[PDB]
Amino acid sequence: DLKASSLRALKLMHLATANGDDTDEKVIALCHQAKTPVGTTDAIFIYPRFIPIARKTLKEQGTPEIRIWTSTNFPHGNDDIDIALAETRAAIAYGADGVAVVFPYRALMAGNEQVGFDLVKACKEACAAANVLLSVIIETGELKDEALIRKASEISIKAGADHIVTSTGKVAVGATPESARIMMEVIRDMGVEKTVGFIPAGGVRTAEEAQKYLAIADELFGADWADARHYAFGASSLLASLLKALGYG
């Protein structure tokens, strides 16, 4: 049922600006966009410095329930733990509800598993102390290989990831049905479905694509699993496609 899946996906969205560029004016507009004729998205996704203005805008339009996610170690996923941690502490201090840290995927590709564990764990500890969720972006489009995708997901989960996320949206290839299935299989195989969620991002553009991603979750975990705590869509123009499927625009 495409209309049913489309409303479900809309409510799970972490809404970002169309080209991933933020300005005050674009972030104010984003906040307004998150308030749709069929309900609100779960959150917005913006750079840290825009958190205060976004919080004010969300409150003033009467939607303070819409959460604010931001990013750290982003988008390049460098292997400097001190820098990633400093950025994560700043994100928390700005007022973020969740922080998406980029996994040091190049380090992993070079065979260094440990740095990814240490980096995620450090950021998780800061977030946990502040009641802020930590998601980990593994950049499946750059990892490419099934074994590497599984490994990055495994390490992130062991290190304390609250969600695992396919992509930054800053490289060409983002989520695919195949990479999403791999990552969800890791959640399943590790038995961490109660504590770890999944987020397809980068390139999820149509209602039909969104339906497919949710269908995989429904199959692996049952239809009730993919609530806001366990699922989100990292997307932008997807919103217009979802509204179109529902009979708006």
Rounded-to-integer distance, Cα 247 and Cα 181, Å: 30
Rounded-to-integer distance, Cα 68 and Cα 10, Å: 16
At 205, which amino acid appears? R
Rounded-to-integer distance, Cα 230 and Cα 135, Å: 11
Q: What is the stated resolution of the deposited model, in angstroms?
A: 1.8
> What's the distance, Cα to Cα, between the start and end of the chain in Å?
20
CB 211 within 8 A of CB 233: no
Residue 110 makes CB contacts below 8 A (sequence gap 6+) with none
Rounded-to-integer distance, Cα 63 and Cα 35, Å: 8
User: Phi and psi of 40, rounded to 5°?
Assistant: -95, 150
- Stated length of the chain: 249
Domain edges within the chain: 1-249
Pairing of strands 39-40, 43-45: unpaired
Structure tokens given for 183 = 């990552």
Closest CA to 247 of 218, 211, 209, 207: 207
Rounded-to-integer distance, Cα 49 and Cα 52, Å: 7
User: Phi and psi of 184, rounded to 5°?
Assistant: -65, -35
Tell me the CA distances in angstroms from 56 to 59, 72, 111, 228, one per residue in order: 5, 22, 44, 23
Rounded-to-integer distance, Cα 167 and Cα 141, Å: 7
**SS3 per residue for the chain:** CHHHHHHHHHHHEEECCCCCCCCHHHHHHHHHHCEECCEECCEEECCHHHHHHHHHHHHHCCCCCCEEEEEECCCCCCCCHHHHHHHHHHHHHHCCCEEEEECCHHHHHCCCCHHHHHHHHHHHHHHHHCCCEEEEECCHHHHCCHHHHHHHHHHHHHCCCCEEECCCCCCCCCCCHHHHHHHHHHHHHHCCCCCCEEECECCCCCHHHHHHHHHHHHHHHCCCCCCCCCECEEECCHHHHHHHHHCCC
Burial grade of 180 (CB within 10 A; 0-12, 13-18, 19 or more): buried
Q: Does domain 1-249 have CATH number 3.20.20.70?
A: yes
Rounded-to-integer distance, Cα 45 and Cα 70, Å: 5
